Amino acid sequence: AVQAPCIQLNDGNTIPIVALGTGRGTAKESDSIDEVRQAVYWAIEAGYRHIDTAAVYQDEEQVGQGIAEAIANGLVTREELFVTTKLWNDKHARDQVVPALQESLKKLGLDYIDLYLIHFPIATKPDDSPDNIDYLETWQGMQDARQLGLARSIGVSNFNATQITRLVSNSYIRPVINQIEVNPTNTQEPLVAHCQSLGIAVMAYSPFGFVVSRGQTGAPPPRSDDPTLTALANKYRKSVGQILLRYLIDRGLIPIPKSTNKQRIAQNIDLFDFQLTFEEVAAINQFNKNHRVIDISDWKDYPNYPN
Numbered sequence: 001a002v003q004a005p006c007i008q009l010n011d012g013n014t015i016p017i018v019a020l021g022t023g024r025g026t027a028k029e030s031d032s033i034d035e036v037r038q039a040v041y042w043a044i045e046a047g048y049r050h051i052d053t054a055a056v057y058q059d060e061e062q063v064g065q066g067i068a069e070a071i072a073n074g075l076v077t078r079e080e081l082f083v084t085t086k087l088w089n090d091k092h093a094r095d096q097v098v099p100a101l102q103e104s105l106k107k108l109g110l111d112y113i114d115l116y117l118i119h120f121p122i123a124t125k126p127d128d129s130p131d132n133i134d135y136l137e138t139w140q141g142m143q144d145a146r147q148l149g150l151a152r153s154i155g156v157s158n159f160n161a162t163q164i165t166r167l168v169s170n171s172y173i174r175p176v177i178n179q180i181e182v183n184p185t186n187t188q189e190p191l192v193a194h195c196q197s198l199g200i201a202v203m204a205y206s207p208f209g210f211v212v213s214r215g216q217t218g219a220p221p222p223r224s225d226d227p228t229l230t231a232l233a234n235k236y237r238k239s240v241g242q243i244l245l246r247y248l249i250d251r252g253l254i255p256i257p258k259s260t261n262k263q264r265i266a267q268n269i270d271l272f273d274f275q276l277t278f279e280e281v282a283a284i285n286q287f288n289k290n291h292r293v294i295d296i297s298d299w300k301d302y303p304n305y306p307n
């Protein structure tokens, strides 16, 4: 239906600039994990060519099922898809990185991943107890996975500006991407600017912020009926969700909208027949509260906590 354009990464690889999210943080009680397989299929059918997943989501198998069905039914070939997955926090020793990737690949039914990310800069033991492995060591394992051909590109997630600078100064290849939370109430303007200045593209997770339900009360504005958002939706004949995603696109970001609904999946990639003005982007930036949807504060005292 709609194929998203690409950003060309610092290693030459091209990445589609909308990714389907497959994290399960928003999944309701009535939502079984097979809906991820169906969502992946529907997304590809609707023109998506980029899927974001992670070992820790425990749904790589479903993602792989959806990919396999899309390929078998002739929607796409493997080389037309861009699959992103992530190394979990208990696999940070250098020698664990390649085997962890091979495990992800087996679950996904793939021979290579397009993008492998360090999920967080924190290292833990398998029981979530803190460890102190330097993410520079983990990055050497990432460099190895790339040299072996198992990952076409390598990047990071949840790295702050100091960590990005240290990683860049102390490695031979810098990340292609930093995947971080970006939405109207957590706009991360300085970190985005820092990454972009270094040629590191940004993937924006939890792109809908608190405009969608997070199973909490006391969420910060804007609501879905916020007058600024609904005026924008009306102006461009788009939904509020599309406005929120286009905002991220106009900041040069790769949003990762999660949906398991056929219609919303299709809406969430239909972002390329309009654009926001600089004043509109500035207005949305004014909602910033540095209030994260993804709260990892139980890890605040861990080595390399990024927030």
Ligand SMILES: NC(=O)c1ccc[n+]([C@@H]2O[C@H](COP(=O)([O-])OP(=O)(O)OC[C@H]3O[C@@H](n4cnc5c(N)ncnc54)[C@H](OP(=O)(O)O)[C@@H]3O)[C@@H](O)[C@H]2O)c1
Pocket (backbone or CB within 6 Å): 020, 021, 022, 023, 024, 025, 026, 052, 053, 119, 157, 158, 179, 180, 204, 205, 206, 207, 208, 209, 212, 213, 239, 241, 242, 256, 257, 258, 259, 260, 261, 264, 265, 267, 268, 293, 294
């Ligand atoms: N540490 C990390 O690197 C990290 C952290 C968080 C997330 N992520 C990634 O980023 C993805 C997105 O973040 P997220 O899972 O927090 O969710 P999100 O994409 O911010 O929000 C998803 C929610 O919005 C709803 N929705 C989707 N499209 C909509 C639309 N057009 N209009 C109204 N509602 C809409 C969804 O419902 P329906 O499903 O019913 O449509 C769901 O409840 C994750 O799935 C994951 O891939 C990565």
